[PDB]
Amino acid sequence: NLEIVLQLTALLFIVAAGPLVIVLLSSRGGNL
Amino acid sequence: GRDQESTGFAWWAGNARLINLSGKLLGAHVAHAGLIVFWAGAMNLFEVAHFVPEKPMYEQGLILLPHLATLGYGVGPGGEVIDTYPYFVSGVLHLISSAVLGFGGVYHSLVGPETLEESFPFFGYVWKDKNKMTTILGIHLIVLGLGAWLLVWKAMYFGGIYDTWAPGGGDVRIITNPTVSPGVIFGYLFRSPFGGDGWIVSVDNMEDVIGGHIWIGTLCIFGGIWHILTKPWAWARRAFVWSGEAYLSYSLGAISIMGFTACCMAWFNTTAYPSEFYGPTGPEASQSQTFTFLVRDQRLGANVASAQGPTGLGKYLMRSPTGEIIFGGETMRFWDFRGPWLEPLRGPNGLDLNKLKNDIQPWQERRAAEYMTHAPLGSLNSVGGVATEINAVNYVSPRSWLATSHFCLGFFFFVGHLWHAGRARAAAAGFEKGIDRDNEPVLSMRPL
Amino acid sequence: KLPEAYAPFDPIVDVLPVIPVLFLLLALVWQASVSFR
Amino acid sequence: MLLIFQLALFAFIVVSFLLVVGVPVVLATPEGWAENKGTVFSGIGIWFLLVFLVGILNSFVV
Amino acid sequence: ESTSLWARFCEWVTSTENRLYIGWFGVLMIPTLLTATSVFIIAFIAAPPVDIDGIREPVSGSLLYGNNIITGAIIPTSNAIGLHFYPIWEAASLDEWLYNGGPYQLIVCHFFLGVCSYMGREWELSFRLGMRPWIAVAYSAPVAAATAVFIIYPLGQGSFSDGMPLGISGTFNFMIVFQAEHNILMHPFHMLGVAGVFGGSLFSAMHGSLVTSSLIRETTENESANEGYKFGQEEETYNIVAAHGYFGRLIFQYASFNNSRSLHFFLAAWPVVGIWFTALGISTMAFNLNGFNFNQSVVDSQGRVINTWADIINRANLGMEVMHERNAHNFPLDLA
Amino acid sequence: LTFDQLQGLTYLQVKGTGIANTCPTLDSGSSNVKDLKPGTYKLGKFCMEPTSFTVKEESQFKGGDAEFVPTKLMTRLTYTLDEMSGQFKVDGSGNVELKETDGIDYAPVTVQLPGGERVPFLFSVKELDAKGNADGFGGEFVVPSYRGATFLDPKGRGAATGYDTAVALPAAGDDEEYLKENIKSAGAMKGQAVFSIAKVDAATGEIAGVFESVQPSDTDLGAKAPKDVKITGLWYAQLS
Amino acid sequence: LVDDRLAGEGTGKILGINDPSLFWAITIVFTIVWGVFYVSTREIDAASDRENDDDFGLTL
Amino acid sequence: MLTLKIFVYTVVTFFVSLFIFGFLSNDPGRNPGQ
Amino acid sequence: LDLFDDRKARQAGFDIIYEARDLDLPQGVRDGLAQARENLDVAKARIKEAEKRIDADLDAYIAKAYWTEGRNELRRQVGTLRFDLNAVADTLPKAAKKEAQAAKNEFLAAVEALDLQLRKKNGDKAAAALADTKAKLDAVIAKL
Numbered sequence A: 001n002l003e004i005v006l007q008l009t010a011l012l013f014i015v016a017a018g019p020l021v022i023v024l025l026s027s028r029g030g031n032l
Numbered sequence B: 001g002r003d004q005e006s007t008g009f010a011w012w013a014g015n016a017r018l019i020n021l022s023g024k025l026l027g028a029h030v031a032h033a034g035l036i037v038f039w040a041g042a043m044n045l046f047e048v049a050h051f052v053p054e055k056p057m058y059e060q061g062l063i064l065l066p067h068l069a070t071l072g073y074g075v076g077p078g079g080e081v082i083d084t085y086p087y088f089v090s091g092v093l094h095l096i097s098s099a100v101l102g103f104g105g106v107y108h109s110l111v112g113p114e115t116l117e118e119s120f121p122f123f124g125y126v127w128k129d130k131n132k133m134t135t136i137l138g139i140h141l142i143v144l145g146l147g148a149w150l151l152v153w154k155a156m157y158f159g160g161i162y163d164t165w166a167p168g169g170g171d172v173r174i175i176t177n178p179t180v181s182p183g184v185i186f187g188y189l190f191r192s193p194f195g196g197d198g199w200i201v202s203v204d205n206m207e208d209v210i211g212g213h214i215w216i217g218t219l220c221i222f223g224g225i226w227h228i229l230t231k232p233w234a235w236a237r238r239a240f241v242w243s244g245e246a247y248l249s250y251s252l253g254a255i256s257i258m259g260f261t262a263c264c265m266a267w268f269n270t271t272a273y274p275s276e277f278y279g280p281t282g283p284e285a286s287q288s289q290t291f292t293f294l295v296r297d298q299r300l301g302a303n304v305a306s307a308q309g310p311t312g313l314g315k316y317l318m319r320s321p322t323g324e325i326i327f328g329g330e331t332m333r334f335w336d337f338r339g340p341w342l343e344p345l346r347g348p349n350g351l352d353l354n355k356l357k358n359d360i361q362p363w364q365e366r367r368a369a370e371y372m373t374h375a376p377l378g379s380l381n382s383v384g385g386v387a388t389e390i391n392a393v394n395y396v397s398p399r400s401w402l403a404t405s406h407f408c409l410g411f412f413f414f415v416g417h418l419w420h421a422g423r424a425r426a427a428a429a430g431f432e433k434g435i436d437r438d439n440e441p442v443l444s445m446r447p448l
Numbered sequence C: 001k002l003p004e005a006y007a008p009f010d011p012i013v014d015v016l017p018v019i020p021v022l023f024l025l026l027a028l029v030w031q032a033s034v035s036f037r
Numbered sequence D: 001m002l003l004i005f006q007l008a009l010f011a012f013i014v015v016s017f018l019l020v021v022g023v024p025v026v027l028a029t030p031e032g033w034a035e036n037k038g039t040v041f042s043g044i045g046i047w048f049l050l051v052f053l054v055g056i057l058n059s060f061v062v
Numbered sequence E: 001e002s003t004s005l006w007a008r009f010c011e012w013v014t015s016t017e018n019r020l021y022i023g024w025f026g027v028l029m030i031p032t033l034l035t036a037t038s039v040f041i042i043a044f045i046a047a048p049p050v051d052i053d054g055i056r057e058p059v060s061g062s063l064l065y066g067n068n069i070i071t072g073a074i075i076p077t078s079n080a081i082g083l084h085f086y087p088i089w090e091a092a093s094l095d096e097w098l099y100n101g102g103p104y105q106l107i108v109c110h111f112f113l114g115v116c117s118y119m120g121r122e123w124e125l126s127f128r129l130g131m132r133p134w135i136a137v138a139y140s141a142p143v144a145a146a147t148a149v150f151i152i153y154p155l156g157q158g159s160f161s162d163g164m165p166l167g168i169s170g171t172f173n174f175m176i177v178f179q180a181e182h183n184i185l186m187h188p189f190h191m192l193g194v195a196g197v198f199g200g201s202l203f204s205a206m207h208g209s210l211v212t213s214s215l216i217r218e219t220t221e222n223e224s225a226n227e228g229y230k231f232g233q234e235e236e237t238y239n240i241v242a243a244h245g246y247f248g249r250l251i252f253q254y255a256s257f258n259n260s261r262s263l264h265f266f267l268a269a270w271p272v273v274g275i276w277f278t279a280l281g282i283s284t285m286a287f288n289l290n291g292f293n294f295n296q297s298v299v300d301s302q303g304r305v306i307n308t309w310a311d312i313i314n315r316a317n318l319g320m321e322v323m324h325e326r327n328a329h330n331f332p333l334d335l336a
Numbered sequence F: 001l002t003f004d005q006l007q008g009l010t011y012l013q014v015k016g017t018g019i020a021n022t023c024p025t026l027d028s029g030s031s032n033v034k035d036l037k038p039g040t041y042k043l044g045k046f047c048m049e050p051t052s053f054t055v056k057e058e059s060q061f062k063g064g065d066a067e068f069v070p071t072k073l074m075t076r077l078t079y080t081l082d083e084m085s086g087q088f089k090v091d092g093s094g095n096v097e098l099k100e101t102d103g104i105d106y107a108p109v110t111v112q113l114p115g116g117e118r119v120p121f122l123f124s125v126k127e128l129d130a131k132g133n134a135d136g137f138g139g140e141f142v143v144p145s146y147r148g149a150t151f152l153d154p155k156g157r158g159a160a161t162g163y164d165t166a167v168a169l170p171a172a173g174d175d176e177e178y179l180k181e182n183i184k185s186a187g188a189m190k191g192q193a194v195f196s197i198a199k200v201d202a203a204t205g206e207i208a209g210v211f212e213s214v215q216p217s218d219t220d221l222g223a224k225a226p227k228d229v230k231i232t233g234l235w236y237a238q239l240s
Numbered sequence G: 001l002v003d004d005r006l007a008g009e010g011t012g013k014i015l016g017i018n019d020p021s022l023f024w025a026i027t028i029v030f031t032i033v034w035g036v037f038y039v040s041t042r043e044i045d046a047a048s049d050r051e052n053d054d055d056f057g058l059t060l
Numbered sequence H: 001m002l003t004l005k006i007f008v009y010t011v012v013t014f015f016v017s018l019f020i021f022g023f024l025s026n027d028p029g030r031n032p033g034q
Numbered sequence I: 001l002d003l004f005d006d007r008k009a010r011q012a013g014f015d016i017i018y019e020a021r022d023l024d025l026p027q028g029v030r031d032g033l034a035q036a037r038e039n040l041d042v043a044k045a046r047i048k049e050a051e052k053r054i055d056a057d058l059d060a061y062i063a064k065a066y067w068t069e070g071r072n073e074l075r076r077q078v079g080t081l082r083f084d085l086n087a088v089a090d091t092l093p094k095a096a097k098k099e100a101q102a103a104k105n106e107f108l109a110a111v112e113a114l115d116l117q118l119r120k121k122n123g124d125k126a127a128a129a130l131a132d133t134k135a136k137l138d139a140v141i142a143k144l
């Protein structure tokens, strides 16, 4: 099950990379 | 960005705020281009990773690898995949290229110039400038022509293109004599779209395929130079709406036609879409069933030519309404199907009876047997077979996915023409927001 | 499959093709952050 | 070279993730494209160097 | 003012003073629809039987040949023809054209051009009257459905004989065979189509009942309430706030459209979007991408298959499959 | 088109033209079958292209002069028998005996009589055994049932498969009115064909001529009386 | 054969032109309609009140 | 049947030509707004 | 039912059709590629038979102007020649394998050039191309 664990881990980053950008801009008062 | 307070467009029509922001509109189009290249790269690597050599391409749900195979990458004689490394570098090259394409999209969208008309007159444009619009049309017309010449260069100088009709079996072949005769080219273009004719979907040689792309490459280059050195004439100026949304609707109508044509190409054509990679077509599978039962019943002992069905028509062999000897049954409708495994048994008058009972090669039987079981029939959840079948086989033909999807895209982009072209005329005329309460046109008309 | 040198990185490839559909949702969450101005 | 190649590929993935989040953040930030523009170019340059490094190392490992 | 023949002709064609607007799409719509109408009426009354399956077994579809209004139909083109173009001039005799199902192709081909031109003619009048141009977009939904069952489904299946017969009982045969081969009921797009028409029927009844319930008193009880409205009124004939108040209490305040413009867009979008998908559903099933197949999906611990309601549907689908086109199949698989 | 001319054409140059439904023409050659060396040849590429279909109709004008009225073809170019093989025996005295074995040897044809009556028939030379001289050599052939034993009628009734009664009529089914229709038979019949040799090419081993065939029509699995169909046309064969 | 027919079905002819007379039918009709249209363009444009210069046509 | 084919080709070309040159006749200018 | 003795059907491959329709078997086994690679003797036999067709049937077809027969003969019983030539050439030593591949490409170019002339219905150029094809094939077989 190491394969699916790695797939979910990689999936966790990418589904968070997007919102990570928005929250950083929202917190830092960015031009978003 | 902007808001509805200063633009009048809500968030759900937000990209309409870019109509006159040429700089940001550039980044929008470059960013979507990065997405297209990203998907091509990501889906290519996804298919390469999930590729098992013990099955054919069409049994693994691959739609991009067949496109690479038809270009003659990593395929040996007979449609056998020998090496998937060329498929790998195709995915990597697109994936990396999407990054720089994505950066330019993000740069030209978020922090680049909003309008290019001031700082960069070469790239700046206003939709009303018909001359400038034609130059952009002319320029991008040349790169399309050059892209077409890449295909013929691949087919004539760089390895070649996979020919499913090649003598000695389907293989990668160098095209040395492309068919550039005007009669052949015009014959395909102005052919009927009905049965037997099939418009351009009936191109059945790689000589005609890359012969046509020579014409397309040349026409687009000359058309590019033409539309660069000339501005639209008076007849055109009084026939088209010269607005940014109007130009979009013209393209939407165009690629709607292209979407429908790709749907029919993937469904019927066996030259540009070899059955070795995309699987059998609808007509091919039905034609393969009667061929399979003709072969197996001969061994059991039966005169297939003299065998009658319940209806009195030939059980195995009958005549088309034009006289050609064809396979019997319901597949009488598919009598205009032509395939690499079936043409050797076909003479000038149709299927040759002597060759059908004396010279059926084992490879022809194996091809027809394989094509019958992989008929383009399946369910939404990818259950192979007719709707009245058990959950045993996990298979839907790539032709089914390609034809079904690009018809839905073709139809919706036709609604794009209807929507974006209707609005283009109304906005230019100036009543896209509603009827003037004090100046209603109908109120000034004679009653019916 | 991928070349043997790229085998450890296979799980990343298995989630890559779904990224483009995330951009549509990313645009939606971006508009929500700015209160759909 | 297999371990060297995979380390370079992993480094390429990590720096790509930094650019995927870092670049839009600094671009949207008003001061970002004026001050952090220097460190973005370093990230772009390193990213391209790893592309070519992984590219040549692919020849000796595949 | 105009003196040129073409200048005067183009003014007449685009004239909004005609009782029925012609326009440029009408010079295509009128001849095609009249051609299809003429042959349809003549064929529905007096056409000879048609060998639809290509097995030399003609099927009677005319009133003068023993059918009533329900069972009468224009039989599709012969299976021997397939998708081949079969105009009347490609037949040796008009008797042969009738026998092979010629009138069906003539109707379907001219009718498809008629509805496409009818759609454009709807845009053209809106432009001539200075109104917003999207009634034609809402009309694209029924056009897509008509195009799917007359053109695209025969295209994917390989024969015009698989198109919908131009008749009442012929339509039912089309649906039943369609279920047996594609399991259309289990397809998510007929599901969206059903929600489109059930919802559209619901929304039509609700909007009609809510507006009728809110009519402002302007008449007596010995007169129709309709008399309270005068054609050309500048004021509203019903109280929108009162109707919103009723429906607000009926479920909850924010489940109701306070905006007439939003409400009417919803009234248009819901059925049009639903019919778009069910039209796509038939188009997708034309290329044999059938609906969900959950047969033998549930099996017990030892492997025994436990039937579900989906398996009972398969039993009904099995019965239609082995009976449609009884004499047409010589081989076990229905690949065509 | 001679046989050599046809073989010089691609399938795409024939598809749709209609020449696929034409027997090859034997040009040059000779008019004397005597040029054929006596012996037993192997009949090959035997093909019979009709040139006319006439159906005998009982005369309502009394007199009993039932004559073959002209018809209109209804099923398009699907009516030539080809690829028929067998043996052809030539005698020194000019005696000719032809025997068909395999090949198409049958084609469903429908024609329409004056009045709108479609008469189907199974144009066939099955088991054709013709003996005679060169000028005329005739024989009888088997005309099988137009509809097979497993053909289901619109009510689901058949011979070897289907209902044996009118299920739509639970009570009046199996009455004397429906006994004839409920019971179906697929027995065969016989026809008479007279052939004639007009051209013979000894060098290429090819013969040609005309034929006249008279056979019954479809009996609707025994539901209707068969009419008499006279088929006149050309024929061609390759002795080898 | 027994009957006569055009036999042009499924033959891939350009615009369906089996015989050259069909070419004259299409060409003559198109030329006539084009002829009456051509001698009327100026009058039609005159109604616009603008001259068909490089800035003529519906433009947003 | 050729006579019928030529008649239809004449008729179809006539109505299509009117459609084509109809929209080329400053169609966009035929609107009630200014 | 009445019985019939079709036990000979398995000979001459009654199960070839059933073998190709077996999803359990790999694609190589279904298509017959695995059998030829495993037993090279059948691959060599089909090369010899393909040579017989080329050095016999083709000459008659060109002389009689039977263009469709000639093209079909180039793809029937020869439709596995490219695979069979590759199958034998793979077993050769690397030095010989390189030379066999070069020879094979020359023969394939000639047979495709011959196919063009048959398509063009050019008897004179086809006969010249046929003679070249027969010469190239002999060189390839000698190396294999």
Ligand SMILES: CCCCCCCCCCCCCCCCCC(=O)OC[C@H](CO[C@@H]1O[C@H](CO[C@H]2O[C@H](CO)[C@H](O)[C@H](O)[C@H]2O)[C@H](O)[C@H](O)[C@H]1O)OC(=O)CCCCCCCCCCCCCCCCC
Pocket (backbone or CB within 6 Å): B058, B059, B060, B061, B062, B380, B381, B382, B394, B395, B396, B397, B398, B401, B404, B405, B408, E188, E189, E284, E289
């Ligand atoms: C007001 C605003 C309103 C907004 C409304 C918004 C609504 C959003 C609706 C979304 C509906 C789609 C939901 C997607 C997630 C569902 C899970 C899923 O999808 O899962 C389904 C499967 C599961 O993955 C795998 O799918 C495979 C499918 O077979 C494929 O692979 C097989 C080999 O294993 C065979 O090779 C076979 O031939 C080949 O088809 C197998 O079934 C595997 O066992 C299975 O694990 O696909 C996959 O997840 C991977 C593919 C998923 C994406 C595919 C997109 C491309 C579609 C192309 C065709 C488009 C249209 C066709 C017409 C449709 C008509 C309805």
Ligand code: CLA
Pocket (backbone or CB within 6 Å): B011, B012, B013, B014, B015, B016, B248, B252, B408, B409, B412, B413, B414, B415, B416, B417, B419, B420, B423
């Ligand atoms: C390359 C083609 C293209 C381009 C460049 C545009 C561009 C534009 N469109 Mg248009 N449109 C197109 C195609 C295109 N459209 C098609 C094909 C249709 C038919 C469906 C439409 C229907 C349409 C309408 C009704 C409207 C526009 C509008 C607009 C403007 C603003 C839209 C916006 O802000 O997006 C915002 C994006 C969203 C709010 C998200 C949309 C959600 C969709 C449904 C995602 C669903 C994805 C899913 C996979 C689809 C399932 C089916 C699929 C499998 C086929 C803009 C200039 C608006 C306008 O008129 O501007 C003035 C407007 O209202 N378009």
Ligand code: CLA
Pocket (backbone or CB within 6 Å): A021, A025, A031, A032, B001, B002, B003, B010, B011, B012, B013, B014, B015, B016, B017, B018, B021, B024, B025, B027, B028, B029, B031, B032, B035, B099, B100, B102, B103, B106, B109, B110, C024, C027, C028, C030, C031, D019, D020, D021, D023, D024, D028
């Ligand atoms: C292919 C899809 C696409 C693209 C390319 C664009 C592009 C654009 N949109 Mg748009 N939009 C889309 C879809 C898209 N949109 C959809 C589906 C909707 C409906 C919800 C909208 C609704 C919408 C509205 C309402 C508006 C726009 C606006 C804009 C423009 C400026 C956005 C901005 O500056 O704000 C800033 C955004 C951010 C700061 C957050 C995004 C940060 C980055 C870009 C996220 C991506 C990170 C990426 C992975 C990094 C990798 C790149 C590289 C390092 C490899 C821009 C050119 C605005 C406009 O019109 O300009 C006047 C605006 O008003 N859009």
Ligand code: CLA
Pocket (backbone or CB within 6 Å): B039, B063, B064, B067, B071, B147, B148, B150, B151, B153, B154, B158, B255, B256, B258, B259, B260, B261, B262, B263, B265, B266, B402, B403, B406, B409, B410, B413
């Ligand atoms: C979710 C959106 C989506 C997706 C995922 C796809 C996906 C796909 N589409 Mg599709 N399409 C879409 C939307 C989409 N489409 C829409 C909205 C439309 C308009 C309605 C279309 C219209 C369309 C058409 C007309 C066609 C496709 C096709 C395809 C398939 C091949 C893609 C391709 O090769 O393109 C193009 C590739 C490029 C642009 C990159 C290559 C460009 C250069 C010039 C090629 C040079 C190659 C060269 C010879 C290589 C040799 C090396 C060289 C150095 C010598 C693919 C699976 C094709 C198909 O398979 O038909 C079914 C096809 O014909 N699509």
Ligand SMILES: CC1=C(/C=C/C(C)=C/C=C/C(C)=C/C=C/C=C(C)/C=C/C=C(C)/C=C/C2=C(C)CCCC2(C)C)C(C)(C)CCC1
Pocket (backbone or CB within 6 Å): A014, A015, A016, A017, A018, A019, C012, C016, C019, C022, C023, C025, C026, C028, C029, C032, D013, D014, D016, D017, D018, D020
């Ligand atoms: C290639 C690759 C890469 C890259 C990646 C990327 C580019 C990513 C991106 C991604 C993205 C781009 C993401 C995003 C996503 C999004 C999301 C996750 C969201 C969602 C949302 C939701 C779900 C919700 C919505 C809503 C709102 C809030 C409003 C109202 C309504 C609703 C609720 C619906 C990496 C680095 C890995 C490395 C390796 C390779």
Ligand SMILES: CC1=C(/C=C/C(C)=C/C=C/C(C)=C/C=C/C=C(C)/C=C/C=C(C)/C=C/C2=C(C)CCCC2(C)C)C(C)(C)CCC1
Pocket (backbone or CB within 6 Å): B027, B028, B031, B032, B034, B035, B038, B045, B092, B095, B096, B098, B099, B101, B102, B103, B105, B106, B109, B110, C006, C009, C012, C013, C023, C024, C026, C027, C030, D012, D013, D016, D020, D054
């Ligand atoms: C403007 C804007 C928008 C959009 C945007 C976009 C659309 C972007 C795109 C972007 C992009 C388009 C990006 C891309 C990226 C990519 C990358 C970054 C790559 C990576 C790669 C890597 C990292 C590596 C990989 C590998 C190889 C090399 C081999 C195999 C293995 C692997 C896979 C690992 C939105 C909507 C938000 C709204 C707002 C505005």
Ligand SMILES: CC1=C(/C=C/C(C)=C\C=C\C(C)=C\C=C/C=C(C)\C=C\C=C(C)\C=C\C2=C(C)CCCC2(C)C)C(C)(C)CCC1
Pocket (backbone or CB within 6 Å): B185, B188, B189, B200, B203, B208, B209, B210, B211, B212, B213, B214, B215, B216, B239, B240, H019, H020, H023, H024
């Ligand atoms: C590559 C290739 C080929 C082909 C080629 C070509 C050469 C194409 C072309 C095409 C062309 C060359 C053309 C087409 C099309 C066009 C179109 C489709 C359109 C038209 C449109 C429109 C839109 C019109 C309009 C109008 C006018 C007149 C103006 C205004 C008014 C109106 C709107 C009415 C082939 C087949 C060999 C196959 C292989 C590949």
Ligand code: OEX
Pocket (backbone or CB within 6 Å): B330, E079, E157, E159, E161, E162, E177, E181, E324, E325, E328, E334, E335, E336
């Ligand atoms: O044609 Mn009317 O229904 Ca369409 O599936 Mn196959 O083909 Mn016949 O059977 Mn089932």
Ligand SMILES: [Cl-]
Pocket (backbone or CB within 6 Å): E173, E323, E324, E325, E326
């Ligand atoms: Cl039925």
Ligand SMILES: [Cl-]
Pocket (backbone or CB within 6 Å): B328, B329, B330, B331, E328, E329, E330, E331
């Ligand atoms: Cl069948």
